[PDB]
């Protein structure tokens, strides 16, 4: 439905996602580890019973009413991981995630507090500014006519060149700034 | 199925540059290069000087003004002695004792 | 009052005879000296108004507005000297001269003893504001902004001109001091009804009244910074000043003719605050907030109790300082992202912490946090309207809820959350911008220590 | 059997309960592929400007400018006076004004009648 | 920004709808404008009335906190549907059953408080007995007058 | 609080979890032991492996990235990218 | 007089001195949090002397030290009311705040903005002591709005998180709905009694005081998270744990209760207001303690605990026992701050794990935290002769033996059982059993900041109930004669709640998988009131604000009638007049009909 | 005044602008009856 690489979820992907959501909401219903492990192997056997169903329509039907069974038997407040979206510590440190370009606007009396760091930042920005036009001309020699098809980015194929559109992935802030 | 060869190559090269960046976010030993720059002083400066200031204030600018510090009059019992007069307040009537 | 009119006029040879790099420094310096001198108007008395000459007087209503007017000129000079840094020198001196001429018209609008001289100055203040909006404005629709500015402020003021001359022919004078002692009770008739409308609808446009307010979220939006500052700080307050002069003559017909305008303002302070909750444009949000706060001043003038006039003049001074600071904050971010969209650049406390503190102070004074004079004005108007009718406390408290909501939503949207990834020209806060914020907020914070000078003629 | 989920305006239908999610029909394949093509074109067009070292400013989004120009500037030129908007503007624009007029007028007539007949408790009221 | 990328009038021909859908960067069939009934929308698209909480949060969004892409058309209430405001996320329980349970519980509690106010609890005692004629001079009675004697006896 | 992770520590712990899973014998497991082709595991078993990694390191791996990790070296590299180790 | 008033004002000025220090900073601090903690420890020591010489005599006074403003009949002076309420609440608040800040020097140690955090926490303490020492309603409104705004700034401490800013805006919305009623009360007192000072309010003593008390109950409903305006308090757990611990347990959320305790001479003569407070408090302590039973986040459960205790405080105000309610404020401070601090020590020892279903096996792993959490739970439930006994047991013993709403007393007893149920729920899922947290153990609590911070509140939760309740002078006549079932009632229903929840706990280890009911979905989804009314009412105030206010009224309908049906009428009257074809016949024939109109019709020739 | 305020508005509904002349023709017709009440002269005789 909504994915970065492809446009859809396959049938096998929806089976695996229902399996994972069913185990997580089961663990939310079944707090203790051993009781969860008992009912989790029971649910795993319930999945593996119709593992070899060759009819795609019958497999889609069993997946659909399995989603119905799951929607009835879900936990109201499922355990969300804390840094996962919906958790308690999700996007908590984003107020400390200052982007990298703010170092360039420092006064020189506080750029002199870290001479080796900015003496290295200059050669990082040098590497970026001599990689930019080569990776742009890499992008326009590989993109098909009518635009790109998927959102998947191509790698660097040559030696000496860097992968295209790499600066805000390599120089992103840390999870604990 | 897992990744494609192109995705594995791009993630490996982004990973190598990302680890180079993270390793180059550390400090040198000389960094930060810093520029060239009374035992119970707390209980003196934060208490005993503000007690002086507030006591001078309340004593010669607040209580010299009418009805600023109004105090509830102290509780008089049978048996007390008024320090302004000396009249002993007489004790209560004898109790119809219960036990 | 001539000792302030003559230095304001000497600001013109001070700005036209300066060196080309010295025209901001000299005008800022000498306008700060005139604002230093403006505090000599505080010679007020409990019985008598400070009556200078036949032409000028200054009671305790006009005095804080005069100090605010003479203080606002250096702040406009500081606020406008960055976006005009690439302007022609002659046009730059013309901009400074329009600001000085507007100050000159304002400081003898507030001191006009006689009401047709008040009218002449009150309509003379349009034309520098006209030139500022429709010369140094920003986008395409600045010419429709001033056209609806000039049409609404003249179509309201035109029956006021006939009404004041009708008072001149009937009473004999338009001296406010004479009409304090020769005022007659205005009875119930249709002639006196349209008399009341002619005397009131001009200032209803200038406050603005809800329903007549549609010039303002274009005239404030398409203005430059000095124009928006003077519009939200003084030119809205000319209506409250004129109402407090003119409701002396309109008794007791006000006591039953004020009901539909009390309904319009009591419901428009709910409507425009709800509109502030859904503005994509930050300068429009500050504009509709200005309408929502002036609606209470309209209610407090139309119910004419002493607590209401004290709260209304406190609220006018407090809202002038607060809205001028909020427009200067919005310009400080517009000078970096070049868009007035509030959802565009977020998370700005992660990049500008001290400016985020100034945003926080301006937001807390926007939502009337005690003991600010914002809350003193807000609270006194609420007290007087509760005395007027006990049911109005629902509309007042509901307005205060929505006021705190849009104030802190503006704070959250502009200052908090995740910052924008694709915006990288966010400069550190200049010393000029923080000087502008501090010279707004520090007088507003100091007026909480001694609030009696901004509480009008009947403190 | 199981309680069927009832989708409302404030609680939409989950994707795991939608019947039209499991359509493998080729018009859905083409629709998702064309939406992916548009989204990939806009994604590449964004990050070409976003990863540029020569840019120091705002990557302008025409959808955002178009959103603000829709929310502000395109209201009167595409307004038509018809029955629905007229009954809504009289129902919601002059309605509460008339309602609060009758409420506050009745309250003040009642209070003035109680004062001018000497019944309202107004002993310590000297601040007004 | 230019004039043919701004919102315009309501499209009535299919080619005007095609130029509008190309302008708003979306497919023509998915392009649903608001119905032309004078509400001031023009050719603006009707995004399907969801919040931003329902969006896929692990996607590498152009606007992460908005969960929004660059060039993707925005809902008319995009500022309303942010995660700092109104959530239209699906709930485990239906909307009507939640309204039934909450209204029934509140109304039942209020009715039972009123009935318990009608049938209070008390203790098997008389009223408290106070000297000096129910404390007449202590409750602010005027000392020039004299009230009725409230005499309490032994029991 | 929160001791720092390394590639050696993540590798040791991922192989430690995969040596406590009965469908993998401990001598055939390596850093590059692909789960489907080499180790003879199922897709569902690989999903449980990802869930064991989530329970081990205390964060959710999304399904679009869970379904692409098909060897322990990719799992270690993905946790290394999501936690920024060797800083 | 010269000692009492001096140390009274020295406490507050000593609090304000580090605010001047942090505002006038030049250098990098030599542990400014240690400076603030030292300063508030000294403020506690300083405020103890006026408390001791209140215990000696009962010496109460008012410091009206600075005249601020006189609006014609209302001399507004800076007026500090030192009565029983100030003299008991100020040392308890300072002792708890001192413990919270020595906790915060441990918990917020990773923060590089720790100086702003301690600045904000001191600003909250200053605003709360402005509130509880206020003598007029303007100054109490200053302290009230101050604790509301510091609640905003401290909920939104991690301001890059969306839900923290959402909860901050929600807390502000509910506090301003309470402020509607508070300003209603101020308006009533100014118009009818010509004062904001409490002395003239208590001396005039009006009979028809229904409406100002309704305003004050609405203010307490906003501030103390009573029913109808409650859901900001569990949402307010998105801030840091010292924020929740100090503000939203013990110090901020008691201000509505403290406001109604401050007006006991006006509620003692109004049985209608007492019935409203009793019904509202019983509804709150039922609903919140019932919602606490199936929540999974530990801070949510302790937030429902403190809101249920505030509902119990509202109940015991409603039975004309204001001093028992204030004693229960002073009692509740110690153990509820300690329970939030123990939950924070567990969360920090489990790396921001705030869910009780990933806890357990922490009996020996965190022995000091286990100890203080069990002692806080027993003080919460009403263990005999801990701190919670001397307040809550007398509250139930006075709620039984009075002319009372019977359903309110019965719901109070059901809430009394529910406290024991969620207390052993916290102990069971948090400490008992076997581990459920992820495999990397980072369990460590051996820092003297954490140890001393929980230790001093532990000594408080053991002894301060006895100490305070035998230092306070008698202000009511306590009911000590009652039958045996009616005396043992709170303890009996508490132990029966323990037993029933032990059954609930032992029925978890079984190998049974029960499908969820409707009671579980009611108590687990917050009672559906933070679900519907946080979607339905923000739908209307956001869509009517455009489709009936912004786009409808401004940009269409007042834009149609005032500027544009006028402007269309002028530009068309040009095109109907200036459409002359330039022909000279057309001009002169227009002259001719004027001759035909002005002479014959208009009659101008005569 | 209210009598001609209705009849001028109904004149706008037979004018052809329907509710526009209702606020225009009836508002002009209202001024006629008020002028007949309080003696309003538009063509006023010179007196001073
Ligand atoms: C006549 C003589 C008078 C002498 C005394 C002065 C009287 C007051 C004047 C104003 C004082 C404050 C001015 C500076 C603060 C604003 C800028 C700022 O934040 O800078 C941070 C900066 C230090 O911070 P940083 O770490 O570097 O950077 C901050 C970060 O960016 C991150 O920023 P941040 O968010 O962490 O920091 C912002 C924070 C944000 O804080 C908050 O949001 C919390 C505040 C609200 C709740 C708490 C207060 C509630 C009200 C109760 C208290 C008042 C009444 C008390 C009385 C008893 C009860 C009635 O604000 C503060 O910390 C300021 C503390 C004081 C707040 C006062 C109230 C503001 C609230 C809004 C209005 C409320 C009503 C009006 C009250 C008026 C009181 C006079 O401060 C300075 O550098 C200060 C510079 C010097 C200031 C001089 C002030 C005097 C100017 C007047 C000149 C003429 C007269 C001569 C007097 C000379 C005195 C030396
Ligand atoms: C650390 C340095 C400290 C200061 C160093 C210098 C002084 C050294 C120590 C000696 C003390 C000085 C002598 C005593 C001080 C002067 C005494 C005096 O008469 O002062 C004149 C007066 C005393 O009051 P007053 O009654 O004489 O004046 C009223 C003003 N008139 C008469 C004109 C109407 O003023 C002061 O003392 C001012 C002190 C203010 C302290 C409180 C600040 C509050 C800030 C918030 C304001 C808003 C509040 C809103 C709410 C109000 C209530 C509802
Ligand atoms: C003593 C008597 C006591 C009587 C009590 C009973 C009567 C009153 C009943 C309550 C009425 C008010 C409550 C309803 C509105 C609640 C609004 C609110 O806080 O919404 C919360 C919502 C976020 O909630 P959520 O989605 O859970 O957040 C998850 C985090 N991402 O936040 C959002 O969606 C953000 C929305 C921002 C704008 C909201 C606008 C709503 C304004 C409401 C004003 C109400 C005024 C009432 C006036 C009463 C006067 C008498
Ligand atoms: C205080 C007095 C405590 C002793 C008197 C009450 C005894 C009682 O009713 O105990 C019930 C029960 C213990 O017995 P139970 O658990 O049911 O049986 C299995 C063996 N433990 O359960 C308990 O005793 C546990 C609850 C104890 C609560 C203590 C605080 C009140």
| G496 Cα: distance to centroid of ligand 4 (angstroms) | 9
Pocket of ligand 4 (CB under 6 A): G 383, 494-495, 498-499, 502
Chains A and H touch each other (3 or more Cβ pairs < 8 A):
no
Helix axes C2-16, C89-107, angle to 10 degrees: 180
**Distance, first Cα to last Cα, chain G:** 100
Ligand that comes closest to the CA of residue G74: 2
Do residue B22 and residue F87 have CB atoms under 8 angstroms apart?
A: yes
A30 and G516: CB-CB below 8 Å?
no
* Nearest Cα to Cα of residue F29 among F60, F81, F66, F75: F75
- Going by CA atoms, what residue is nearest to atom 28 of ligand 1? C354
- Give CA–CA dist B12/F74, Å, rounded: 10
Q: Measured between alpha carbons, how far is residue G214 from residues C401, G210, G273 in Å? A: 18, 6, 7
Separation CA D27–CA C182 (nearest Å): 86
- Name the neighbours of A, counting chains with at least 3 Cβ pairs within 8 A: B, C, D, E, F, G
Whether chain H has a CB inside 8 Å of the CB on C188: the answer is: no
Partners of C114 in the β-ladder: C175
D42 shares contact with chain C (CB less than 8 Å): no
Ligand 4 atom closest to Cα of residue G424? 26
Closest-CA residue to G190 (of G73, G80, G64, G70): G73
Ligand nearest, relative to CA of residue G163:
3
What are the domain boundaries of chain C? 1-459
Is the bond leading into A44 cis (omega within 30 degrees of zero)? no
In DSSP notation, G165-219 reads HHHHHHHHHHHHHHHHHHHHHHHHHHHHHS-SBHHHHHHH--S--HHHHHHHHHH
Contact C260 D97 (CB under 8 A): yes
Which tokens is G486 given? 């009616």
Q: D128 to each of C4, G173, G193, G200, how far by Cα in Å?
A: 37, 30, 12, 18
Lookup: tokens for G490: 């709170």
CA distance A83 to chain F (A): 7
Chain D window 12-41: which residues touch C at a Cβ cutoff of 8 Å? none
Query: What radius of gyration do chain D's Cα atoms show?
Result: 30
Is there a contact between F11 and F76 (Cβ–Cβ < 8 Å)? yes
Nearest to F51 among A5, A13, A20 (CB): A20
Interface test with A, best of B20, B26, B32 (most A CBs within 10 A): B32
Inter-chain CB proximity C191 and H40 less than 8 Å: yes
Mutation pick from A20, A31, A49 vs chain F, by most beta carbons of F within 10 Å, is A20
Bridge partners of G64, per DSSP, are G79
From the list A47, A81, A176, the residue facing F58 with the nearest CB is A81
Cα separation of C1 and C41, whole Å? 9
**Touching chains H and E? (3+ Cβ pairs < 8 A):** no
Residues of H in contact with C189 (CB under 8 A): 38
- Residue C253, token pair as written in the block: 């017909």
Please name the residues in contact with G76: beta carbons below 8 A apart, sequence gap of 6 or more: G67, G68, G69, G70, G136, G138, G196
Which of the 8 DSSP states describes residue G401?
Answer: S
DSSP secondary structure letters along D71-126? HHTSSSTT----HHHHHHHHHHTSHHHHHHHHHHHHHHHHHHHHHHTT-S--SS--
Q: Name the DSSP class of D8.
A: -
Q: How far apart are CA G93 and CA G6, in angstroms?
A: 20
Which chain C positions have a beta carbon within 8 Å of D57's beta carbon?
A: 338, 423-425
Distance from CA of F65 to the nearest CA of E (A): 9
Whether the CB of G544 sits within 6 Å of ligand 3: no
Distance CA A108, CA C428 (A): 14
Q: Which atom of ligand 1 is nearest to the CA of G149?
A: 47
**Gap from CA of C430 to ligand 2 centroid (Å):** 36
3-state secondary structure of G134: strand
Q: CA angle C404-C409-C411, nearest 5°?
A: 95
Contact A92, G160 (CB under 8 A): yes
As given in the structure block, the two tokens for residue G401 are 């033996």
3-class state of residue G404 by DSSP: strand
Q: Do residue D72 and residue C281 have CB atoms under 8 angstroms apart?
A: yes
Is F84 a known active-site residue?
A: no
Contacts of G192 in chain D (CB under 8 A): 121, 124-125
Cis bond upstream, residue C252 (ω within 30): yes
Rounded distance between C-alpha atoms, residue G71 and residue G75, angstroms? 7
Task: From F84, F87, F56, F59, select the one nearest F72 (Cα to Cα).
Answer: F56
- Whole-number Å distance, alpha carbon G535 to ligand 3 midpoint, is 9
Centre of ligand 1 from the C-alpha of residue C430, in Å: 20
Neighbours of G197 (CB within 10 A): 25
CA–CA dist B92, B74 (Å, integer): 19
Cβ-defined contacts of A137-143 (< 8 Å, 24+): A138/A164, A139/A164, A139/A165, A139/D44, A139/D48, A143/D44
The burial class, CB within 10 Å (0-12 / 13-18 / 19+), for F32 is exposed
Which among D61, D74, D78 has the least Cβ separation from residue E70? D61
**d(C-alpha G120, C-alpha F30), whole Å:** 53
**Residues of chain E positioned with their CB less than 8 A from the CB of A2:** 55-56, 59
Point out the catalytic residue in the list F25, F42, F65, F81: F42
Q: Locate E94 and state its tokens.
A: 């239906």
Residue of E nearest to G546 (CA): E77
The radius of gyration of chain C's CA atoms, rounded to the nearest angstrom, is: 21
Q: Is the CB of G536 inside a 6 Å radius of any atom of ligand 3?
A: no
Report, in angstroms and rounded to the nearest whole number, the Rg of chain H calculated over CA atoms: 13
Restricting to D residues 80-99, those with a Cβ less than 8 Å away from any Cβ of C are: 96-97
Q: Whose CA is nearest to atom 89 of ligand 1?
A: C442
Residue C51 dihedral angles phi and psi, to the nearest 5°: -100, 100
G434 CA from centroid of ligand 4 (Å): 22
Give the C-alpha separation, E56 to E45, whole Å. 22
CA distance G346 to G369: 8
Contact (Cβ atoms closer than 8 angstroms) between residue G171 and residue G152: yes
**Torsion over CA: B9, B14, B15, B19 (sign):** positive
Does residue G358 contact residue G314 with C-beta atoms inside 8 Å? Answer: no
Determine the Cα–Cα distance for residues C33 and C40; give it in Å rounded to an integer.
12
For residue D61, the chain E residues in CB contact (below 8 A) are: 70-71
Contact E57, A85 (CB under 8 A): yes
């Amino acid at each position: 439905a909504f994915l970065p690489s492809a446009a859809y979820l396959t049938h096998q992907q929806k089976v695996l996602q229902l399996y994972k959501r069913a185990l997580r909401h089961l663990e939310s219903r079944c707090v203790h580890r051993d009781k969860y492990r008992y009912f989790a192997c029971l649910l795993r056997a319930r999945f593996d019973e119709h593992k070899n169903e060759k009819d795609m329509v019958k497999a889609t039907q069993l997946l659909r009413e399995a989603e119905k069974e799951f929607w009835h038997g879900q936990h109201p407040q499922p355990y969300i991981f804390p840094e996962s979206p919906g958790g308690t510590s999700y996007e908590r440190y984003e107020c400390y995630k200052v982007p990298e370009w703010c170092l360039d606007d420092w006064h020189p009396s506080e750029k002199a507090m870290y001479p080796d760091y900015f003496a290295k930042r200059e050669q990082w920005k040098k590497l970026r500014r001599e990689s930019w036009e080569r990776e742009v001309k890499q992008l326009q020699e590989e993109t098909p006519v009518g635009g790109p098809r998927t959102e998947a980015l191509p790698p660097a194929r040559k030696q000496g060149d860097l992968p295209p559109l790499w600066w805000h992935i390599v120089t992103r802030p840390r999870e604990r700034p | 199925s897992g990744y494609t060869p192109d995705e594995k190559l791009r993630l490996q090269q982004l990973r190598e540059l990302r680890r180079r960046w993270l390793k180059d976010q550390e400090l040198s030993p000389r960094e930060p290069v810093l520029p060239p720059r009374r035992h119970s002083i707390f209980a003196f400066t934060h208490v005993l000087i503000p007690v002086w200031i507030i006591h001078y204030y309340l004593k010669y600018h607040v209580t010299t003004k009418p009805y600023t510090i109004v105090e509830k009059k102290p509780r008089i019992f049978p048996g007390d002695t008024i320090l302004e007069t000396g009249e002993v307040i007489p004790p209560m009537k004898e109790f119809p004792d219960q036990h | 009052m001539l000792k302030y009119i003559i230095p304001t006029m000497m600001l013109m040879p001070l700005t036209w005879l300066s060196k080309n790099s010295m025209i901001w420094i000299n005008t800022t310096l000498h306008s700060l000296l005139i604002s230093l001198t403006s505090l000599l108007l505080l010679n007020q008395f409990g019985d008598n108004s400070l009556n200078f000459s036949l032409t000028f007087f200054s009671d305790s209503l006009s005095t804080p507005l005069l100090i605010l007017t003479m203080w606002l000129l250096p702040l406009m000079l500081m606020a406008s000297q960055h976006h005009l840094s690439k302007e022609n020198l002659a046009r730059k001196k013309l901009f400074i001269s329009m600001l000085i001429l507007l100050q000159l018209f304002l400081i003898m609008t507030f001191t006009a003893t006689e009401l047709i001289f008040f009218y002449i100055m009150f309509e003379a203040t349009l034309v520098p504001t006209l030139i500022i909006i429709t010369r140094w404005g920003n986008q395409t629709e600045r010419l429709n902004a001033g056209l609806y500015f000039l049409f609404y402020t003249l179509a309201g003021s035109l029956p006021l001109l006939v009404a004041l001359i009708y008072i001149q022919n009937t009473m004999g004078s338009l001296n406010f001091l004479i009409l304090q002692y020769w005022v007659q009770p205005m009875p119930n008739s249709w002639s006196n009804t349209f008399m009341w409308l002619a005397c009131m609808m001009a200032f209803m446009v200038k406050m603005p009244l809800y329903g007549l307010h549609l010039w303002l979220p274009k005239a404030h939006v398409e203005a430059p910074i000095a124009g928006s500052m003077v519009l939200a700080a003084i030119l809205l307050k000319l209506g409250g000043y004129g109402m407090m002069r003119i409701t002396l003559l309109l008794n007791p017909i006000t006591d039953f003719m004020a009901y539909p305008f009390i309904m319009l303002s009591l419901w428009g302070m709910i409507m425009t605050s709800s509109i502030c909750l859904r503005q994509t444009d930050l300068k429009s949000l500050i504009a509709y907030s200005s309408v929502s706060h002036m609606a209470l001043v309209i209610v407090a003038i139309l119910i004419q109790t002493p607590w209401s006039y004290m709260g209304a003049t406190a609220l006018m001074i407090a809202h002038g300082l607060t809205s001028s600071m909020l427009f200067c904050l919005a310009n400080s971010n517009y000078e970096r992202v070049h868009s007035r969209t509030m959802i565009l650049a977020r998370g700005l406390q992660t990049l500008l912490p001290l400016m985020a503190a100034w945003w926080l102070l301006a937001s807390l004074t926007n939502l009337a946090l005690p003991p600010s004079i914002n809350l003193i004005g807000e609270l006194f108007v609420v007290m007087s309207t509760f005395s007027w009718s006990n049911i109005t406390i629902i509309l007042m408290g509901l307005n205060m809820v929505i006021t705190a909501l849009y104030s802190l939503y503006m704070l959250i949207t502009t200052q908090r959350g995740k910052h924008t990834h694709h915006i990288n020209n966010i400069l550190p806060s200049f010393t000029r911008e923080n000087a502008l914020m501090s010279l707004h907020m520090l007088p507003l914070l100091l007026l909480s220590l001694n609030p009696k000078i901004i509480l009008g003629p009947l403190y | 059997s199981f309680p069927k989920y009832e989708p409302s305006r404030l609680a939409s239908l989950p994707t795991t309960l939608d019947p039209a999610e499991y359509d493998i029909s080729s018009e859905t394949r083409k629709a998702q592929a064309e939406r992916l093509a548009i989204r990939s074109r806009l994604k590449r067009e964004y990050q070409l400007q976003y990863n540029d070292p020569s840019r120091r400013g705002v990557v302008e989004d025409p959808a955002l400018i178009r959103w603000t120009c829709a929310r502000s500037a395109n209201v009167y030129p595409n307004f038509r006076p018809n029955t629905k908007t007229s009954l809504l503007g009289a129902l919601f624009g002059i309605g509460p004004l008339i309602f609060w007029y009758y409420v506050f007028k009745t309250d003040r007539d009642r209070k003035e009648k109680l004062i001018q007949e000497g019944k309202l408790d107004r002993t310590f009221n000297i601040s007004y | 920004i230019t004039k043919d990328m701004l919102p315009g009038p309501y499209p009535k021909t299919p080619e005007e709808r095609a130029a509008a859908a190309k302008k708003y960067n979306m497919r023509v069939e998915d392009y649903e404008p608001y119905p032309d009934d004078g509400m001031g929308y023009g050719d603006y698209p009707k995004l399907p009335d969801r919040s931003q909480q329902e969006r896929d949060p692990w996607y590498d969004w152009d606007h992460p906190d908005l969960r929004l892409n660059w060039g993707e058309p925005m809902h008319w209430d995009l500022d309303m549907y942010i995660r700092n405001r109104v959530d239209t996320s699906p709930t485990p329980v239906n909307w009507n059953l939640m309204c039934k349970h909450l209204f029934g519980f509140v109304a039942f509690m209020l009715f039972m408080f009123w009935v318990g106010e009608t049938y209070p609890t008390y203790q098997p005692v008389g009223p408290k007995q106070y000297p000096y004629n129910n404390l007449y001079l202590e409750r602010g009675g005027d000392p020039n007058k004299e009230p009725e004697p409230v005499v309490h006896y032994e029991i | 609080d929160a001791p720092p992770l390394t590639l050696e520590g993540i590798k040791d712990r991922v192989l430690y979890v995969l040596k406590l899973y009965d469908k993998i014998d401990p001598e055939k497991l390596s850093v590059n032991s692909h789960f489907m082709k080499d180790l003879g595991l199922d897709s569902l078993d690989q999903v449980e492996i990802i869930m064991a990694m989530e329970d081990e390191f205390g964060f959710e791996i999304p399904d679009i990235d869970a379904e692409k990790l098909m060897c322990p070296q990719e799992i270690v590299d993905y946790i290394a990218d999501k936690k920024d180790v060797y800083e | 007089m010269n000692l009492f008033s001096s140390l009274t004002l020295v406490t507050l000025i000593l609090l304000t001195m580090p605010i001047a220090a942090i505002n006038f900073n030049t250098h990098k601090f030599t542990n400014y949090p240690l400076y603030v903690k030292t300063t508030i420890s000294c403020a506690f020591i300083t405020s103890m002397i006026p408390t001791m010489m209140f215990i000696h005599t009962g010496q109460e006074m008012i410091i009206s030290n600075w005249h601020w403003l006189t609006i014609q009949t209302l001399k507004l002076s800076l007026s500090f009311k030192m009565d029983f309420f100030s003299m008991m609440f100020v040392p308890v608040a300072l002792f708890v705040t001192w413990s919270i800040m020595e906790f915060s020097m441990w918990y917020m140690h990773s923060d590089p903005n720790i100086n702003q955090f301690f600045k904000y926490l001191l600003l909250f303490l200053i605003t709360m002591l402005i509130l509880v020492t206020a003598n007029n309603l303007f100054q109490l409104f200053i302290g009230w709005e101050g604790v509301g705004i510091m609640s905003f700034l401290l909920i939104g401490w991690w301001y890059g998180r969306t839900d923290a800013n959402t909860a901050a805006l929600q807390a502000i919305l509910y506090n301003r709905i309470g402020d509607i009623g508070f300003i209603l009360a101020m308006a009533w007192f100014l118009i009818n009694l010509n004062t904001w000072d409490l002395q003239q309010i208590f001396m005039l003593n009006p009979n028809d005081s229904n409406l100002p008390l309704m305003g004050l109950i609405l203010a307490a409903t906003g501030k103390s998270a009573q029913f109808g305006l409650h859901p900001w308090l569990p949402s307010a757990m998105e801030g840091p744990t010292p924020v929740s611990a100090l503000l939203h347990s013990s110090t901020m959320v008691v201000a509505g209760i403290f406001l109604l305790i401050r007006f006991y001479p006006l509620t003692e003569n109004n049985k209608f207001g007492q019935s409203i407070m009793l019904c509202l408090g019983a509804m709150t302590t039922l609903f919140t303690a019932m919602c606490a039973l199936t929540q999974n986040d530990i801070k949510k459960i302790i937030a429902f605990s403190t809101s249920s205790q505030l509902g119990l405080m509202m109940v015991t105000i409603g039975i004309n026992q204001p001093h028992l309610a204030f004693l229960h404020i002073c009692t509740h401070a110690f153990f509820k701050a300690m329970l939030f601090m123990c939950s924070g020590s567990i969360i920090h020892s489990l790396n921001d794990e705030q869910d009780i279903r990933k806890m357990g096996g922490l009996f020996k792993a965190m022995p000091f935290t286990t100890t203080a959490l069990i002692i806080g739970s027993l003080a919460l439930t009403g263990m005999p002769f801990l701190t919670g006994f001397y307040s809550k047991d007398l509250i139930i013993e006075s709620a039984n033996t009075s002319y009372t709403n019977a359903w309110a007393l019965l719901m109070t007893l059901v809430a009394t059982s529910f406290t024991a149920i969620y207390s052993t729920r916290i102990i069971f899922f948090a400490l008992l059993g076997q581990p459920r947290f992820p495999t990397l153990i980072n369990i460590n609590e051996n820092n003297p900041f954490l140890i001393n911070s929980i230790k001093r509140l532990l000594i408080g939760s053991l002894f301060a109930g006895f100490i305070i309740s035998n230092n306070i002078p008698p202000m009511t006549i306590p009911q000590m004669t009652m039958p045996h079932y009616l005396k043992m009632t709170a303890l009996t229903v508490t132990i029966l709640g323990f037993i029933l929840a032990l059954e609930i706990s032992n029925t978890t280890h079984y190998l049974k998988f029960n499908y969820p009911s409707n009671t579980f979905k009611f108590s687990n989804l917050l009672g559906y009131y933070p679900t519907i009314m946080h979607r339905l009412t923000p739908y209307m105030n956001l869509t009517m604000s455009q489709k009936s206010a912004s786009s409808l009224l401004d940009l269409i309908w007042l834009e149609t009638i005032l500027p544009k049906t006028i402007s269309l009428a002028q530009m068309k009257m040009s095109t109907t007049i200036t459409s002359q074809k330039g022909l000279i016949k057309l001009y002169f024939l227009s002259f001719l009909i004027t001759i035909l109109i002005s002479t014959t019709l208009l009659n101008f020739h005569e | 005044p209210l009598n001609y305020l209705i009849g001028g508005c109904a004149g706008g509904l037979t004018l052809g602008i329907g509710a526009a002349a209702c606020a225009y023709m009836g508002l002009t017709a209202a001024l006629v009856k008020m002028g007949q009440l309080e003696g309003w002269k538009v063509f006023a005789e010179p007196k001073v």
